Design a protein around this ligand. Sequence first.
Ligand SMILES: *[C@@]1(=O)C(=O)[N]C2=[C][C]=[C][C]=C21
Ligand SMILES: *[C@@]1(=O)C(=O)[N]C2=[C][C]=[C][C]=C21
Ligand SMILES: [Cl-]
Ligand SMILES: [Cl-]
Lengths: 187, 187
Amino acid sequence: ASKRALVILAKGAEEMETVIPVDVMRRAGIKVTVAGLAGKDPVQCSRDVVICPDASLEDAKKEGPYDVVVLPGGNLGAQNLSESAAVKEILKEQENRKGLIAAICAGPTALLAHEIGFGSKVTTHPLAKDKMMNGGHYTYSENRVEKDGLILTSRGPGTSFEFALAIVEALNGKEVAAQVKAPLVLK
Amino acid sequence: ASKRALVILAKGAEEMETVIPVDVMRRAGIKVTVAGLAGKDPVQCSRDVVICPDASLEDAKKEGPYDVVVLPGGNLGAQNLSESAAVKEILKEQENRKGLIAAICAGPTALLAHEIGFGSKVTTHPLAKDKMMNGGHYTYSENRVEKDGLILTSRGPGTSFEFALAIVEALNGKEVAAQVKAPLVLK
Ligand SMILES: *[C@@]1(=O)C(=O)[N]C2=[C][C]=[C][C]=C21
Ligand SMILES: *[C@@]1(=O)C(=O)[N]C2=[C][C]=[C][C]=C21
Ligand SMILES: [Cl-]
Ligand SMILES: [Cl-]
């Protein structure tokens, strides 16, 4: 059975950090649902790319649970994720079932907001470090991708392929990740 | 005055190769128009990400000319671009005015289709090489980004940041490209 990913798409999300993981995960044969935080309507990302979600979050959450919940960055997207009770509930449920939780750039700051994965080693965008670290609830890392416990984090648009491939590795294994990687012409 | 980019978005385009250049160019302060080949309606990309264009190609072409015309890859997107008379006319006009023409992955094969930039050094995705090289009209390169004459090409999703930053360099200069690069957390 194919693994399943939920990608939560909020206004202000970083579109590169949304599309790279969606695309790479679909290359890996993962069933990905792009779920709109606000509803079924198109979402205006940080640099004005407009993406139409596969479903509302309201609907997607009733088709759970998922093998991974993915939080893109973009500062305003992460703020929107951080303010959402629906997101809080999805993440808590994922944590409780010991499922993978993945977040990139400022995305990890929504984990802080919702009190998810405290005690884990995490990375963020450099400019999001101080926010993430408020209270010392996580241990900070400068690795381009980090993984500790349930929590997989990464730093920025430029680490999005590595982040996505780490998700593929976690779900489908190293060999699939390597096979997906090769045609991409990564460095 | 800000430089202007036209990104032509066809069904089957590689969504990473579409969004990375759009986003990076907008970070560089370039005015980017995402123009739908088929019209104003949302476009289903290769891995099923659905992007809403800023305008139809029909409308965008009347707001030209542009400092760069950008052709994403994705094999079926490039086939759609290659079959379009509107694309042909836009590219011919761009060539005639000695403007930049940029294409990635299989995107450069639409240059072949429309007889654009013959004699230039080009790269493509490795799997698109034989198509591009039919007739020996270009000189092939394995550089991750290549630029010769009017024609800027690149290889795949994994070279999209380098491709986008090369476009920024060409239009706005090396310093702007370097400033845009730094926050991205590239290798
Ligand atoms: C990233 O996408 C984020 O969430 N915050 C930020 C700041 C600068 C560059 C990239 C990012
Ligand atoms: C690329 O996007 C394209 O146009 N053709 C292709 C084949 C394999 C991987 C990436 C690409
Ligand atoms: Cl941002
Ligand atoms: Cl393709």
